[PDB]
Symmetry: D2
Subunit: 146 residues, 4 copies
């Protein structure tokens, strides 16, 4: 079962995808997760529209699904969307907006991290290239190209 727990509606789609990545880990290729989540979020968003849900509102989303041949097959029947109007849940709404905000800031950190890892991957590749080149030019060592 996929469960978001409480989430501000504005950020329901990201939360769905995040949970989906975590629970299908190793069981499915990322592209499938992205594809499966995109579909569900399309459906969810239509229902949120029909339900008069604002982005300030808080929702909980649940849905059973199955993995068949490495493919996520949703059971749309099992989809539940609990809604919580901001005006009826002032504090919950406030807390979820706070969560959403903490997350936007954390993403700046992740992007900083990603940039570093990218640089790192590049440098690592260069080092591996240079090293192999030295093997070729300055030694009789067994080569990768052998």
């Amino acid at each position: 079962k996929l469960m978001t727990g409480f989430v501000r509606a504005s950020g329901y789609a990201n939360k769905v995808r995040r949970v989906l990545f975590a629970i299908t880990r190793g069981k499915v290729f990322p592209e499938e997760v992205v594809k499966a989540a995109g579909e569900l979020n399309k459906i969810i968003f239509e229902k949120l529209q029909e339900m008069g849900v604002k982005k300030e509102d808080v929702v909980r989303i649940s849905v059973d699904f199955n993995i068949e041949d490495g493919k996520i097959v949703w059971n749309l029947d099992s989809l539940e969307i609990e809604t919580y109007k901001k005006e009826e849940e002032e504090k919950l709404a406030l807390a979820m907006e706070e969560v959403e905000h903490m997350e936007k800031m954390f993403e700046e950190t992740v992007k900083e991290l990603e940039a570093l890892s990218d640089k790192l991957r590049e440098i690592s590749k260069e080092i591996s290239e240079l090293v192999e080149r030295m093997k070729q030019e300055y030694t009789g060592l067994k080569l990768r190209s052998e």
Copy 2:
């Protein structure tokens, strides 16, 4: 284009040929071709060294013109020259080449140490890249590589 080993102890002619070949075809040819081309030449050279009564203590100089055609090394076997220098006639040169050969065996231990390090590094770098992407997937709305 010409391949030249300069002075080299016969025992290590084949590695030297390959090393020079890698350096001068750099960018112009895929490594596998270099390995393949050198292997062929070294096969021929070794037959000639046998015929010439060359010992591994002797010192040789090898020269050979070749062309790169369609990214392939084509030797001109006609241009191949093998100058030989008998240890007994060139005791100092022979000694020096043996010293070179020895310094090179030691330097290879260093390179292997370096390679191991770079391998570990590559592994760690890949792990970090994997983990980072996973955090993007699980803790953010950031654009994913898989998108």
Copy 3:
């Protein structure tokens, strides 16, 4: 300058205080001071939470003004506000905060994985730097760091 936790399950107030403190004093203060200042405040807060009959299932909001003087965090205990929200009166808020707390415990496993990786990385990087310098020493006339 004001420290604000926003909504947080009481059970994890102390970590949240420290986290917010690190973020807002960034660059202005040494980490050891942040740890020291937060430890003090959290000591006081916990006494008050005890006196207030706050359970760890309850949700609190903490606010407190402070000043940085000579790179030292000086709390203004007068400005400290502890808003409390009983689980039984705020079942959904309490549930949400417990969910947050849980997502955070899981995220920490990820951070520890990352830390381990970065540690390995630091070690490998140091080794590489050592080896490289050693090659400068042993196989080159290059200017050395020790010069």
Copy 4:
């Protein structure tokens, strides 16, 4: 004993230092090696001058030394400088010049490597900093500053 083996005179000083680094490895601090070699090479160069040795000539240098309290103490008495005039040793001289040349080229490679390792060290430090910062800002994990 320190022994250079055959070396073109032009590059005797670097060869001395290199051999010294290799044989005192772990037994002595680099600064001492640099200091000790600098001294010997000063003396050697004076003798090379007195001996009418050109830089095209080939020399062999031997010298016993002792390590006392982590300090290299030369035994100048044991110093031997075999010389080989280019004109009397055409082929040896040619070979040593070739060696010297291969070494100049290899140094370009080492400098490339050093630059990479420097970048790597920098990136590694940044990563360690960022990681610790995330511990501080997004977790309750035990900190290094604790």
